[PDB]
Amino acid sequence: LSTITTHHLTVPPGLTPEEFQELSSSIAEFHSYRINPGQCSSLLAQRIHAPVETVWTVVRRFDKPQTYKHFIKSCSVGEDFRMTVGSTRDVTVISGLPAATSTERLDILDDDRHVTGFSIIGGEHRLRNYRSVTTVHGFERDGEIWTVVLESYVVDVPEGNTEEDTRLFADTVVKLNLQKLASVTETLAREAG
C-alpha cells in the first residue's frame, strides 16, 4: 500500500555523514512523506559557504524564484502581493517551446525555522501533484560558518513514464537550481555590503 519515505534514514549526495547526523531530526520532521504506489520522492542537499540568513533571504522570496532558478522567463504574483501561505505565483519556464507554465501555491513560510515549500496547482507540465519543501540550516565548526540547504519533493509519476526518468528529471532541475542558489548566495556573502 502507501509507504513512508526514508530520506531521513539515508545520506543524500553532497552531504557528509557528520552533517546528516546533525540534520536527521529536521529531515524526519520536514522531509518525510506518506506516498502511494503512483508516486515518487527525493531529497537533495547543497552545501553553501554563506551564513544562513544570506541564503534564507533568497530562498524565502516566493515572488522571485528566478533569482536562484534556471529557465524562468517570468514570475507573476499580481497585486497587491503579500507573502502569506496560500498566495500563488504563475511561473513561465523557457526550457522548451512553447514555454512550460506552472501555477504554484506557497504552502509554508517559517522565517524562524527557515522552512518554506510550495505545491504546483495548475499550468502545462507533467509534474502532477508536485510538492516540495526547502529547509535552511546553519553549521559551525571552530568558528567557521556554512549553510546546508535541503530540498525534497513528492510527485506523481506521469503515465507513460518510469519512476527513474521522473526522478532524474526532477532531481536534475532541483540540483541545478540548488547550484545556482549556492553561486548567487556565495557571491552575495563574498561581496557583503
Phi, psi dihedrals of residue 38, rounded to the nearest 5°: -85, 5
- In the list 170, 178, 181, 182, the residue contacting ligand A8S (rule: CB under 6 A) is 170
If the CB atoms of residues 22 and 171 are measured against ligand A8S, the closer one turns out to be 171
> C-alpha cell of 142?
571552530
* Bridging pattern class, strands 115-124 and 3-4: unpaired
Number of residues that bind ligand A8S (CB under 6 A): 13
Query: How many angstroms from the chain centroid is the CA of residue 85?
Result: 16
**Per-residue x/- track, 16-55, ligand A8S (CB under 6 A):** ----------------------------------------
> Cβ closer to ligand A8S: 18 or 124?
124
Binding test (CB under 6 A) with ligand A8S, winner from 52, 174, 178, 181: 174
User: What's the closest the beta carbon of residue 97 comes to ligand A8S, in angstroms?
Assistant: 12
Q: Which stretch binds ligand A8S (CB under 6 A): 17-25, 46-54, 124-132, 185-193?
A: 124-132
Question: 50 vs 57, 136, 149, 160, CA distance in Å?
Answer: 12, 11, 11, 42
Nearer to ligand A8S, 18 or 165 (CB): 165
Parallel/antiparallel/unpaired status of strands 34-35 and 3-4? antiparallel
User: Binding to ligand A8S (CB under 6 A): which residues in 64-123?
Assistant: 69, 71, 93, 95, 100, 102, 120
What are all long-range contacts of 187-193, with beta carbons under 8 Å and residues at least 24 apart?
A: 188/50, 188/54, 188/58, 189/49, 189/50, 189/51, 189/54
Min. distance of Cβ 125 from ligand A8S in angstroms? 4
Question: For ligand A8S, which residue of 127, 150, 178, 182 counts as binding (CB under 6 A)?
Answer: 127
Q: For binding to ligand A8S (CB under 6 A), which residues are involved?
A: 69, 71, 93, 95, 100, 102, 120, 125, 127, 132, 170, 173-174
